Structures are given as structure tokens and as C-alpha cells.
Amino acid sequence: TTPLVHVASVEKGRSYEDFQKVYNAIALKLREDDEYDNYIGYGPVLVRLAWYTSGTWDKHDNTGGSYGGTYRFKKEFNDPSNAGLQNGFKFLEPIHKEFPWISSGDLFSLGGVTAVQEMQGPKIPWRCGRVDTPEDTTPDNGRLPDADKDADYVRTFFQRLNMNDREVVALMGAHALGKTHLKNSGYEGPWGAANNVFTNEFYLNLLNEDWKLEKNDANNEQWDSKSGYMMLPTDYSLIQDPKYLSIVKEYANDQDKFFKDFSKAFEKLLENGITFPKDAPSPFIFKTLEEQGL
Numbered sequence: 001t002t003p004l005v006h007v008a009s010v011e012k013g014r015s016y017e018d019f020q021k022v023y024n025a026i027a028l029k030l031r032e033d034d035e036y037d038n039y040i041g042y043g044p045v046l047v048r049l050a051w052y053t054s055g056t057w058d059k060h061d062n063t064g065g066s067y068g069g070t071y072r073f074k075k076e077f078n079d080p081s082n083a084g085l086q087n088g089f090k091f092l093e094p095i096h097k098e099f100p101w102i103s104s105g106d107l108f109s110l111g112g113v114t115a116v117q118e119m120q121g122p123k124i125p126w127r128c129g130r131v132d133t134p135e136d137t138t139p140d141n142g143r144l145p146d147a148d149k150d151a152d153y154v155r156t157f158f159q160r161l162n163m164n165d166r167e168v169v170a171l172m173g174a175h176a177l178g179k180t181h182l183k184n185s186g187y188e189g190p191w192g193a194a195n196n197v198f199t200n201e202f203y204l205n206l207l208n209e210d211w212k213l214e215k216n217d218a219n220n221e222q223w224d225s226k227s228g229y230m231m232l233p234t235d236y237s238l239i240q241d242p243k244y245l246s247i248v249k250e251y252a253n254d255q256d257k258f259f260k261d262f263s264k265a266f267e268k269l270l271e272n273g274i275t276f277p278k279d280a281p282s283p284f285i286f287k288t289l290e291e292q293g294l
């Protein structure tokens with residue numbers, strides 16, 4: 001099938017104010033549902049959801065991506081690849097009901113942006129206009145990366161998402177958030193201590209901790225530290241590859257640089273496959289609840 005073009009179309013009669021209200025609803029629920037996942041909260045899984053849905057994109061034929069907001073998950077979340085994502089969709093359901101006018105793609109991606117900012121991460125410019133395509137569903141089957149691979153696999157995989165070395169290393173820093181859950185992915189443990197605060201801890205831990213490759217309770221190999229942290233083989237490959245290593249060191253020593261690069265890469269990820277008209281509104285930069293005194 002000929003490559004389809006997806007033009008961003010602003011939800012009829014909606015403006016910045018409307019989306020800030022959605023952002024606020026998401027942010028308020030993040031604050032309210034504080035007990036989820038042993039008090040980590042829904043922040044991490046929402047970021048994962050935004051990445052996963054956008055990560056289905058294929059630059060070659062512009063299939064997948066965040067635009068359509070319509071997907072079919074393998075085994076309906078009963079697969080090591082997508083298990084756990086249902087928690088994010090469940091969290092967003094009440095938000096969508098309160099704001100039925102927002103497209104699914106806009107909601108899923110906005111959920112990630114809101115989560116990163118509320119967790120004290122960098123501001124992520126975000127654009128509206130994704131249009132639901134119920135007639136065009138994108139199966140996630142084999143489109144997201146395996147975690148038991150090396151640096152060459154990671155580099156090649158991300159080329160499909162049009163990401164270079166710096167973009168890949170920056171995006172991976174999101175693993176400072178949340179944790180792996182054995183029953184979900186066959187991996188267990190957090191990557192750091194501040195599981196729900198967005199910082200460059202991922203890089204510091206990679207370089208500073210004493211890691212040991214071991215099999216977990218699912219018989220899968222992962223790198224463990226005495227501090228109680230873990231790294232997937234794909235995470236660890238970032239310090240095994242010399243080109244990735246230099247960038248990990250850069251981010252480990254410059255919090256501001258990491259924030260700026262992550263912001264650019266994350267927005268790009270969430271916008272891959274979308275064509276924005278020259279007269280489309282400028283990207284929205286939402287204020288956090290804190291900045292609004294809410």
C-alpha cells in the first residue's frame with residue numbers, strides 16, 4: 001500500500017486552554033492515585049505507554065506511530081512485550097470520559113508528556129491534531145524492541161524510528177522511571193532509587209554501580225547491583241558500545257544537557273509520522289500543577 005500521509009487536524013474549536021485542562025486532569029489523577037505499584041504511582045507506566053504506542057512507527061511506510069491512536073496488542077496484554085500497559089490505558093479511561101473530544105492519540109501522548117513534567121522532568125513541547133483511525137489498526141506484534149539484545153540490535157532497531165545514537169541514549173534515560181516487573185516482562189527490579197522523579201540517574205547508575213550478570217526468577221539474564229538496581233541487556237549495551245558510552249558519560253555529567261536532548265527526542269518520537277500544516281498552532285508548553293499553584 002502506498003505510504004499514507006497523516007495531517008494533524010486540531011480538534012474542532014479546541015485551543016491551548018482546553019489541552020491544559022486535560023493535562024491538569026491527568027496530573028491531578030497522578031497525584032490522587034498515589035498507591036499504584038507500591039507507591040511508585042502511574043507516572044512511569046504512562047511514559048512507557050506513550051513510548052510504546054509511538055514506538056510502533058515505521059519510517060519506511062509510515063505505519064504505526066501515535067497518529068491513529070488505534071492499536072491491537074498481542075495476546076491482549078498477555079505477552080512479555082506489552083504486559084502492564086493495560087494499567088496506563090485504565091488510568092486514562094476516566095480522563096477520556098471527562099474530555100471525550102480529545103483524540104486517543106493526543107491523549108496517549110499527552111499522558112506521557114504530563115507524567116514526565118509532573119515528575120520534575122523537562123518541559124516537553126506537545127502538539128495536538130492526531131486523528132483516530134478506527135479503520136486503520138496497528139498491531140504491536142514484533143514492532144517494539146526485545147530487551148535481551150546487544151548494542152548493534154539497539155542501534156539498528158532505532159533506525160526504524162529515525163533516531164540516531166544521541167537520540168537513542170537520551171530516550172533510554174527514561175528508564176530512571178519505574179521498574180521491570182517479573183510477571184510482566186520476565187525482568188525484575190528498578191533501574192534506580194528515585195523510581196518516580198525524572199533525573200539523569202539512569203546514566204549515573206550505569207557508570208557508578210558494580211554490576212553482575214545473573215539469571216532472574218524467570219531464567220532471563222539481567223545486570224544486578226548490590227544497591228538493588230538492575231539493567232536490561234539493552235540498557236547495559238549502552239556502556240559496552242564505545243559510541244554509546246561517550247554519550248552516557250555526557251548525560252551522567254550534565255543534567256541540563258540530558259533534559260534538553262530528552263525533550264527534543266521525546267517530542268520527535270511522539271510526532272513521528274505526523275505532518276503539521278504551516279498554519280498549525282505552535283507547540284504547546286504546559287504549565288505543571290506546581291507552576292499553576294494547583
Ligand code: HEM
Nearest residue numbers: 044045048051084146147171174178179180181184185234
Ligand atoms: C531498547 C529499548 C527499550 C527496551 C528493550 C525496553 C524494555 C522495557 C521493559 C522490558 C520494561 C519493563 C516492563 C515491565 O516489566 O513492566 C520497560 C519499562 C519501561 N520503559 Fe522501556 N524499553 C526500551 C525503551 C524505552 C524508551 C525509549 C522509553 C521511553 C522514552 C521507555 C520507558 C519505559 C518506562 C518509563 C518503563 C517503566 C514502566 C513501569 O514502571 O511500569 N522504554 N521497558
